[PDB]
């Protein structure tokens, strides 16, 4: 039990879910905030919902309505849902450069003004789109200066705390990073919130990795695993969808390419078209990814493995028929005395538009603390716990040591 | 290639964008086609050279496509990738470095292909200026050509030296060039960029 345990007391008639969405006009001078709310319990005509948008102390917009959506099909609509739309003139936009945030409050009350209960979330106005081969944020094209980060503490193992999160964030921002990839599973909830607030772009990734199968595909191509996989994707989305920092969804990691991915990718697109989906498995440019997102592709040299070659990044883009943007999910393996050639990458990124950066691999060394004959600590690695079988140093590829002290 | 080059106008477009030259231009294209269309060796039609990019080109390019869809059309003027060419066909674009002149930059060839929205093949109408002691870097080109599919080669510039024979005080011949005929104004050696000398003897 490595993350928290809580108790939540809800009213009988409550808010069961809600989502936020923001549309903009051609120049972003106007937006619409759209909130869809669903409730559970008995539906009584005196029930209302109010969604209010604050900016600080200042209420910017508010909307009130009673349950009951628009007609959706031949049987009608959702009586237990309501969608409000608030107009916001000249909204302050969220970005990693300036994390403009608003507060959204969702009140479930009766008409006489009595509050049954309230929920809330931070809201960031931003638009994410792939357009014409480019990935845009609020209309301009990003250049991702990112890194992959695992949830690792030398002392606590995989238990995360606010202090650690924050440290990481600040180091990253201080060091010129824009974004982080949740290699390779959904993170501790607070993470998104901090990113939302400090300003980092986040790629949220499903907890699915079947690297060790042969071939890699074996389960992901099997309909019998479809359900299990399905839950790893869907729940992630239902949970993190309202955070502004999340700009891209990822189907998992190194699980080859199976029909299960294709389905899940389509699912997402249907459910939340606000973000792009990416998946590297099976060659990095499959039908299950909106972005070419290889790992360890060289700048100028090709590595043409059978079935799944890794072309030089500059070349990959102009392969016949290709038009997607390219962002490396992992590049520049930072294991020990490393990072040679880092600049070559930076230069291509800067010269080719469709090369919108990448995620360095990785943030922290996954070393653990051990103690000697005199209660003296020391950094341990693969196989140091009599662990079998093991990959030794392979767990140390960070840019910073487990204590958060930097490697050169 | 059509006999049309208005390199010396300012801007380059000046006549090719003028409806009044449409007819004249038109005949330079149409007659070429009517005459050479049955030869198998001809695989691509070109609208001319260095005459910028005008509405006259667009029309003529469409004409050809209509009349003889068996071949592609190419024209470099106006940026090398206009709407009047089926192929990106720049001249002197470098392999790896960009030359971003206003209006008509010359991107590095590897980069040019992946510019957003671009999908045509790229073949250089002129590259590797073979003037005098030259051809350095030739290999860089060959290597890109070989690594990138959409880079289907190019045309070196050029075959023979455009030098002419003159005779001395004793009926001895010698190779003459720009301005050697009291010619004004002139571009001197600029007429010698061949891979072979005018006599057809090779340069190294």
Q: Does B98 touch chain A (CB under 8 A)?
A: yes
Is A322 among the residues known to form the active site? no
Place of tokens 């100028």: A300
Q: Does B186 touch chain A (CB under 8 A)?
A: no
Q: Which residues of A touch B98 (CB under 8 A)?
A: 351
- Do A93 and A177 belong together in one domain? no
Structure determined via = X-ray
Sequence ranges of the binding site of B? 5, 7, 50, 126-129, 186, 190, 193
Quickly list DSSP for A277-344: EE--TTTS-STT-SSB--BS--SS--B--SSS-B--HHHHTTSTT----EEEEEEEE--SS--TTHHH
Q: Does A315 touch chain B (CB under 8 A)?
A: yes
CB-neighbour burial class of residue B73 (10 A; exposed 0-12, middle 13-18, buried 19+): buried
- Do A133 and A213 belong together in one domain? yes
Residues 6+ positions from A224 with CB-CB distance below 8 Å: none
- Nearest-CA distance B64 → chain A (Å): 26
Per DSSP, helices labelled H in A86-180 are: 162-174
Best residue of A318, A350, A355 to probe chain B, by most B CBs closer than 10 Å: A318
CB-neighbour burial class of residue A320 (10 A; exposed 0-12, middle 13-18, buried 19+): exposed
| Cβ–Cβ gap A317/B149 under 8 Å | no
Query: In Å, what is the CA distance from B29 to each residue of A199, A404, B13, B54, B73?
Result: 59, 70, 17, 15, 11
Domain of residue A342, residue span = 127-408
Option in A314, A319, A354 nearest B116 (CB): A354
Quickly list DSSP for B24-72: HHHHHHHHHHHHHTT-TT---EE--BS----HHHHHHHHHHHHH-TTS-
Query: In Å, what is the CA distance from A275 to each residue of A131, A355, B165?
Result: 12, 19, 70
Report the C-alpha gap between A237 and A207 in whole angstroms.
Answer: 12
- Do A73 and A148 belong together in one domain? no
- Do A165 and A46 belong together in one domain? no
Place of tokens 């290699």: A183
Q: Which two tokens stand for residue B180?
A: 């050697």
Residues 6+ positions from A97 with CB-CB distance below 8 Å: A199
- Do A43 and A105 belong together in one domain? yes
How many structural domains are present in chain B? 1
| Cβ–Cβ gap A352/B150 under 8 Å | no
- Do A110 and A148 belong together in one domain? no
Is A231 among the residues known to form the active site? no
| Cβ–Cβ gap A319/B149 under 8 Å | yes
Contact A292, A317 (CB under 8 A): yes
Find the residue in A nearest to B147 (Cα). Answer: A315
Among residues B31, B194, A380, the alpha carbon closest in space to that of B45 is found at: B31
Query: In Å, what is the CA distance from A160 to each residue of A152, A165, A178, A181, A209?
Result: 7, 7, 21, 16, 21
- CA dihedral (A384, A389, A393, A395) in degrees, to 10, reads -100
- Do A121 and A195 belong together in one domain? no
Residues 6+ positions from B4 with CB-CB distance below 8 Å: B16, B25, B28, B29, B47, B48, B49, B51
Q: Which residues of B touch A140 (CB under 8 A)?
A: none
Option in B108, B116, B149 nearest A134 (CB): B116
Option in B98, B116, B148 nearest A133 (CB): B116
Best residue of A315, A352, A353, A355 to probe chain B, by most B CBs closer than 10 Å: A315
- Do A52 and A91 belong together in one domain? yes
| Cβ–Cβ gap B147/A352 under 8 Å | no
Residue pairs between chains A and B whose CB atoms are closer than 8 Å: 41
CATH number of the domain enclosing A36:
2.60.40.10
Contact A205, A252 (CB under 8 A): yes
Per DSSP, helices labelled H in A94-222 are: 162-174, 190-194
Residues 6+ positions from A245 with CB-CB distance below 8 Å: A124, A192, A195, A196, A199, A200, A201, A202
CATH number of the domain enclosing A203:
3.20.20.80
Pair type for strands A140-141 and A144-148: unpaired
- Do A156 and A38 belong together in one domain? no
Q: Does B114 touch chain A (CB under 8 A)?
A: yes
Per DSSP, helices labelled H in chain B are: 22-36, 55-67, 109-112, 138-147
- Do A143 and A86 belong together in one domain? no
The experimental resolution of this structure, in angstroms, equals 2.8
- Do A97 and A132 belong together in one domain? no
Place of tokens 């060659």: A283
Q: Does B175 touch chain A (CB under 8 A)?
A: no
Option in A302, A314, A353 nearest B116 (CB): A353
Q: Which residues of A touch B148 (CB under 8 A)?
A: 315, 318
Sequence ranges of the binding site of A for substrate? 254, 330-333, 397
Report the C-alpha gap between A259 and A220 in whole angstroms.
Answer: 7
Pair type for strands A14-24 and A377-380: unpaired
CB-neighbour burial class of residue B14 (10 A; exposed 0-12, middle 13-18, buried 19+): middle
Report the C-alpha gap between B156 and B103 in whole angstroms.
Answer: 25
- Do A114 and A157 belong together in one domain? no
């Amino acid at each position: 039990i490595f993350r928290d345990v809580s108790l939540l007391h809800k009213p009988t008639t409550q808010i069961s879910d809600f989502h936020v969405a923001t549309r903009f006009n051609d120049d972003f001078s106007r937006a619409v905030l759209e909130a869809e709310v669903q409730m559970c319990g008995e539906l009584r005509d005196y029930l209302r919902v109010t969604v209010s948008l604050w900016q600080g102390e200042t209420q910017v917009a508010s909307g009130t309505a009673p349950f009951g959506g628009e007609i959706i099909d031949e049987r009608g609509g959702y009586a237990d849902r309501v969608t409000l739309r608030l107009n916001v003139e000249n909204p302050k936009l969220w970005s990693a450069e300036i994390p403009n945030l608003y507060r959204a409050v969702v009140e479930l009350h009766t008409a006489d003004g009595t509050l049954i209960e309230a929920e809330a979330c931070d809201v960031g106005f931003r638009e994410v789109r792939i357009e014409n081969g480019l990935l845009l944020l609020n209309g301009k094209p990003l250049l991702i200066r990112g890194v992959n980060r695992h949830e690792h503490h030398p002392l606590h193992g995989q238990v995360m705390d606010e202090q650690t999160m924050v440290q990481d964030i600040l180091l990253m921002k201080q060091n010129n990073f824009n974004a982080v990839r949740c290699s390779h599973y959904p993170n501790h909830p607070l993470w998104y919130t901090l990113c939302d607030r400090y300003g980092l772009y986040v790629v949220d990734e499903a907890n699915i990795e079947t690297h060790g199968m042969v071939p890699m595909n074996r389960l992901t191509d099997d309909p019998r695993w479809l359900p299990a996989m399905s839950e790893r994707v869907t729940r992630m989305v239902q949970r993190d969808r309202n955070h502004p920092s999340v700009i891209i969804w990822s189907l998992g990691n190194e699980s080859g390419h199976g029909a299960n991915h294709d389905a899940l990718y389509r699912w997402i697109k249907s459910v939340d078209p606000s973000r792009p989906v990416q998946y590297e498995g099976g060659g990095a440019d499959t039908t299950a990814t909106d972005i070419i997102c290889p790992m360890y592709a060289r700048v100028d040299e090709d590595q043409p493995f059978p079935a799944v070659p890794k072309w030089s990044i500059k070349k990959w883009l102009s392969l016949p028929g290709e038009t997607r943007p390219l962002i490396l999910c992992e590049y520049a393996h930072a294991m020990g005395n490393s990072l040679g050639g880092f600049a070559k990458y930076w230069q291509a990124f800067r010269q080719y538009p469709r090369l919108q950066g990448g995620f360095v691999w990785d943030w922290v060394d996954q070393s653990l603390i051990k103690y000697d004959e005199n209660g003296n600590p020391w950094s341990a690695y693969g196989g140091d716990f009599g662990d079998t079988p093991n990959d030794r140093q392979f767990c140390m590829n960070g840019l910073v040591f487990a204590d958060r002290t930097p490697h050169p």
